[PDB]
């Protein structure tokens, strides 16, 4: 049993997987078995969601996170995001579940039966962490794989039925994207937008042409990059900047996944384009604005003149100005005036909310949607009692947006920690003092006193 | 070598669980305090004393179960099982809150037993009794909060009830009624608790990160031997590190470890002193200069005036259900509320 | 060496009284700016319209506060999450009215304190130490990020960031209780176990090491003189300490390995505090404490209150009173 105790490996059981660092065969098994676990969950969780699913309640009233992802791709839904066929969901679940058996088979085989190291077996599949060119080649294969993944999304949107478009003229619907945004000024312009309010960096993406165009770019960047890394070896300045070890590379990826986790958190919290409110529920900003809209409609029906109604502080009770003058809802939702959503936008003019439109053009479907969103705000308890923290038991609800934001924050946070842990460890191991200070060569002892 | 010394021998045998003369106080008192808590939280109501369900039997969960204080009309009755209230009736005694004084009083004697145990063991093993000395802080907290505080108030009803949610209620009561956050004795408590948690984290991390390489293993715990003479980590390197990161650093390990006793122990003792004042409603509730200014100037606002508005809401909204013996009826129209909410 | 080389050598020098380092080149100026602005604003800033309702709250000493009441007040709810640097204001007077110092301070501070953490890794590397002191500091750091950045992001405004001041801190806590029932949240409960337990273990370790110091001094001198900086020999007897504590409880509940003990001292508070930070950072997205309001119902359907319902009434008091002029609509949704 090669290296499967502390004496021989130098690693205790609780650091057991570090015993795998230089055993490329068993480590391939660990990786493939784990990819199995991810695929298993995607498949099983979907079947579970589908079994529990009542197609005439909103998804977001049903604790669903995976059906909403399938529906955003335009599968299984029609106008308004109404479920028209659950069979695409069943297919996604079954096919992942079946695929996980295969991955789990390969993982178990590599992990316990196959060759422990691959280097003797094959010079193509074997690798030395310290072989910079081999590391960049494998990285290159994976980049090409990822760019093909990104182009699968583009193929779905342009050639295989489209995507769910909450912004579609006349009402949300599945729509084929025929004119994806190619202009790099628009695509890369997102990357240079501020992440602060009213701007929101990439999270502000608000139309499927930009989404599809971005993935066209990203797919080509990733395939070009992958070819690059297969054809080159790292340059001198990169050689001198990094640590070249399995543990260092892990650290870099932990750092990157952490960053992606925080971004995903903000994406599901604020973005209502690639996370349609039809499927995920209203965003926090959306539901607060929907409350102001609800009472503006109510009191205006009763006779209030909502443009000239002064609230207790002197600011408009329903309507006021943003710091740059745009007309926006009043009360605490003043903070949310950068919110944009298909049910509100028909009321917006060049100067912000239009009082003429408010007085004359508000349709019953806007009243309904604002009422629905106001009463499904993403607030709720850990035991899924919907509403404010003092609300009574009655409504079983926590928004999928809160589930997805909180889980991803927690994950991103612990991944930053793992980044620091592994990056600091990789540095120390490379320099040779990860196990402690040499008592006969204690560096501080050869340094001058501070004073 | 009479019976006293023979008993002494037996009490002091080196066994899996040491007993001692202190064990005769400690074991029964601690067992009953803990058993009384488990018994009440599992089976016993607070319907007659508080108008609350408080046990698994009634449907509470681990967060909401409690053994609750007796009714306010009991005053500071010892509430002895054989006393004039329960008159020997175990059922009625449960219904009147007898388990509350049961747990608080055996708990108090049990803590005395525990501290005697720390003294007794230190003496037998031949170490200095600083662990017992440090334990005076838990004792000052228990005694101030569970005994002195209700003794200065109307009755045991206002002591904390033994329960997770119940203790949370006790925190929020102290905010709304005593403004206890404003009290510099509580603030010193906070600094010594958070300061002690800081010291715990930073010293554990420093030792673990200035370790000498004493084995070949990448898992470094095995490279220590209890009987070894040598320090397992470098004080000199640690000292340089913090001198250069933070500006100062420990250089004396005896001082370091004494300070680790001093800080959280001192914090707890300070918070206890503030709670003794609260027994008498002797609060740090207000800054008089602030109130005089705000009364005359309706544009003057600070976070201090804002928190008193919150306190006034807590008191008006919680008192009728939290203090049922007062029979409060507050018509909707008198309840303090801001706009809309 | 050339100029650049010499500069690098000085920056990364292990011989500077305070380590500078590359993290330090960002840390030094950002922390100085945050400090200077805080000090001046705390003393002399005019009132700030925190809730965007033209109701300015006085935070500074010269405008009627003492050390306990004073604060640098969060930026205006009218601003929300918009970036409000000095040059976005038409004037300093406007910048002050709207709470611009708060943003300048918390952004320079969070950047500088993140660099403080990197700098702890950096020095440990220069000195040939193990690297994870910085991972311990990530716990208070993560908590500062939760209250000054993540909570404002979730709620949509830096006006809901923790104020920089003693009373404003309590204000943030009480309102947080009203809106999330944090006390009933298990991540805050783990936090409490982390800091109460950190204090308990701090005192415990202090008292056990102190109890077993080896006699090296007379009674007319401090026993501290019994230890000399840099001596090779341990200064207490671990075997007597364990002999003590294993009998206090029982043998196997006591640590006989100092590395194990010290790791536990690091891990217990750090992990609890990571959960505290994560409680704040997930209540930022309104996944709130347990809600057992009216959970216990009798055979007819009467509500039988529990302590959770009494908590609920205190929370209602906070909710209805906070920011008493800011709400126009019946639900407080952020």
């Amino acid at each position: 049993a090669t290296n499967r105790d502390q004496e021989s490996s130098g690693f205790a059981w609780w650091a057991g997987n570090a015993r795998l660092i230089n055993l490329s065969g068993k480590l391939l098994g660990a990786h493939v078995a784990h990819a199995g676990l991810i695929v298993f969950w995607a498949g099983a969780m979907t079947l579970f969601e589908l079994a529990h699913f009542i197609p005439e309640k909103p998804m977001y009233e049903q604790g669903l996170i995976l059906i909403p992802h399938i529906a955003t791709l335009g599968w299984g839904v029609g106008p308004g995001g109404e479920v028209v066929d659950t069979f695409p969901f069943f297919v996604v679940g079954v096919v992942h579940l079946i695929s996980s058996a295969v991955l789990g088979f390969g993982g178990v085989y590599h992990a316990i039966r196959g060759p422990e190291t691959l280097e003797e077996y094959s010079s193509f599949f074997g690798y030395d962490w310290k072989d910079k060119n081999k590391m960049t080649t494998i990285l290159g294969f994976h980049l090409i794989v990822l760019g093909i993944g990104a182009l699968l999304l583009v193929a779905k949107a342009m050639f295989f039925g489209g995507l769910y478009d909450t912004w579609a003229p006349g009402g949300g619907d599945v729509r084929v994207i025929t004119n994806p945004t190619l202009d790099p000024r628009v695509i890369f312009g997102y990357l240079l937008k501020s992440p602060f309010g009213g701007e929101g960096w990439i999270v502000s993406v608000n139309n499927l042409e930009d989404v599809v165009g971005g993935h066209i770019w990203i797919g080509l960047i990733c395939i070009a990059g992958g070819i690059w890394h297969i054809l080159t070896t790292p340059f001198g300045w990169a050689r001198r900047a990094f640590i070249w070890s399995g543990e260092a590379y892990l650290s870099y990826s932990l750092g990157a996944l952490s960053m992606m986790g925080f971004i995903a958190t903000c994406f599901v919290w604020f973005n209502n384009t690639v996370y349609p409110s039809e499927f995920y529920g209203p965003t926090g900003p959306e539901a607060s604005q929907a409350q102001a809209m609800t009472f503006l409609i109510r009191d205006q029906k009763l006779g209030a003149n909502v443009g000239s109604a002064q609230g207790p502080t002197g600011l408009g009770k329903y309507l006021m100005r943003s710091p740059t003058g745009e007309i926006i809802f009043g009360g605490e939702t003043m903070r949310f005036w950068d919110f944009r959503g298909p049910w509100l936008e028909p009321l917006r003019g060049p100067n912000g909310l239009d009082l003429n439109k408010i007085k004359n053009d508000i349709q019953p479907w806007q009243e309904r949607r604002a009422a629905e969103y106001m009463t499904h705000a993403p607030l709720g308890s850990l035991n899924s009692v919907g509403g404010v923290a003092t609300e009574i038991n009655s409504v079983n609800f926590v928004s999928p947006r809160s589930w997805l934001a909180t889980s991803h924050f927690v994950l991103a946070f612990f991944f930053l920690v793992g980044h620091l842990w592994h990056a600091g460890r990789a540095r120390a191991a490379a320099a040779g003092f990860e196990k402690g200070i040499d008592r006969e060569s204690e560096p501080v002892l050869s340094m001058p006193s501070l004073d | 070598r009479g019976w006293f010394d023979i008993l002494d021998d037996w009490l002091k045998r080196d066994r899996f669980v040491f007993v001692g003369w202190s064990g005769i106080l400690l074991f029964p008192c601690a067992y009953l305090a803990l058993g009384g808590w488990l018994t009440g939280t599992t089976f016993v109501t607070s319907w007659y004393t508080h108008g609350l369900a408080s046990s698994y039997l009634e449907g509470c969960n681990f967060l909401t179960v409690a053994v609750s204080t007796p009714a306010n009309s009991m005053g500071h009755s010892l509430l002895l099982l054989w006393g004039p209230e329960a008159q020997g009736d175990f059922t009625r005694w449960c219904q009147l809150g007898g388990l509350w004084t049961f747990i608080a009083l055996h708990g108090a004697f049990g803590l005395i037993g525990f501290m005697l145990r720390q003294f007794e063991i230190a003496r037998l093993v031949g170490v200095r009794p600083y662990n017992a000395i440090a334990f005076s802080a838990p004792i000052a907290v228990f005694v101030s909060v569970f005994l002195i505080y209700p003794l200065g108030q109307s009755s045991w009803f206002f002591a904390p009830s033994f329960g997770v949610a119940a203790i949370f209620r006790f925190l929020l009561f102290f905010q709304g009624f005593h403004n206890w956050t404003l009290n510099p004795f509580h603030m010193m408590g906070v600094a010594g608790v958070l300061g002690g948690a800081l010291l715990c984290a930073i010293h554990g991390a420093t030792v673990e990160n200035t370790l000498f390489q004493d084995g070949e293993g990448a898992s470094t715990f095995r490279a220590f031997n209890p009987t070894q003479a040598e320090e397992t980590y470098s004080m000199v390197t640690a000292n340089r590190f913090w001198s250069q990161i933070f500006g100062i650093a420990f250089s004396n390990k005896r001082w370091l470890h004494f300070f680790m006793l001093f800080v959280p122990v001192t914090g707890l003792w300070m918070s206890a002193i503030g709670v003794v004042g609260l027994a008498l409603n002797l609060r740090s509730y207000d800054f008089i200069s602030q109130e005089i200014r705000a009364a005359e100037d309706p544009e003057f606002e600070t976070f201090y005036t804002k928190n008193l508005l919150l306190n006034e809401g807590i008191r008006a909204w919680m008192a009728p259900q939290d203090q049922p013996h007062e029979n409060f009826v507050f018509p909707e129209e008198v309840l303090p509320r801001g706009n809309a909410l | 060496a050339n100029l650049w080389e010499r500069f690098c050598n000085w920056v990364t020098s292990t011989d500077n009284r305070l380590y500078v380092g590359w993290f330090g080149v960002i840390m030094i100026p950002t922390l100085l700016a945050a400090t200077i602005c805080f000090v001046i604003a705390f003393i002399a800033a005019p009132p700030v319209d925190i809730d965007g309702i033209r109701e300015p709250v006085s935070g500074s000493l010269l405008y009627g506060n003492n050390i306990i009441t004073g604060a640098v007040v969060p930026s205006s709810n009218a601003i929300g999450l918009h970036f409000y640097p000095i040059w976005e204001a038409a004037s300093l007077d406007e910048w002050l009215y709207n709470g611009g110092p708060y943003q300048l301070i918390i952004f320079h501070f969070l950047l500088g304190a993140s660099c403080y953490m990197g700098r702890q890794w950096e020095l440990s590397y220069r000195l040939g130490m193990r690297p994870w002191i910085c991972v311990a500091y990530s716990a208070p750091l993560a908590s500062a990020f939760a209250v000054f950045l993540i909570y404002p992001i979730g709620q949509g405004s830096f006006s809901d960031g923790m104020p920089l001041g003693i009373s404003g801190t309590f204000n943030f806590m009480i309102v947080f209780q009203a809106e999330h029932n944090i006390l009933m949240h298990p991540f805050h409960q783990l936090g409490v176990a982390g800091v109460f337990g950190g204090a308990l273990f701090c005192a415990m370790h202090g008292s056990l090491v102190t109890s077993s110091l080896i006699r090296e001094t007379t009674e007319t001198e401090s026993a501290n003189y019994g230890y000399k900086f840099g001596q090779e020999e341990e200064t207490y007897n671990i075997v007597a300490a364990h002999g003590y504590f294993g009998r206090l409880i029982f043998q196997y509940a006591s640590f006989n390995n100092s590395r194990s003990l010290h790791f536990f001292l690091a891990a217990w508070p750090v992990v609890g505090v990571w959960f505290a930070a994560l409680g704040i950072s997930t209540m930022a997205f309104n996944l709130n404490g347990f809600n057992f309001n009216h959970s216990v119902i009798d055979a007819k359907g009467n509500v039988i209150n529990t302590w959770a319902d009494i908590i609920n009434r205190a929370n209602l008091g906070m909710e209805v009173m906070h920011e008493r002029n800011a709400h126009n609509f019946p639900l407080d949704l952020a």
Binding site: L450 | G247, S251 | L61, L62, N66, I67, F229, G230
Partner: peptide
Amino acid sequence: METITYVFIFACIIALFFFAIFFREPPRIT
């Protein structure tokens, strides 16, 4: 007078930090 007092105590504490760091008794291996 009160503001002066608060700022005075604060400025003393800042001075104290300066002396405690730069004018500390130096730690000596001995």
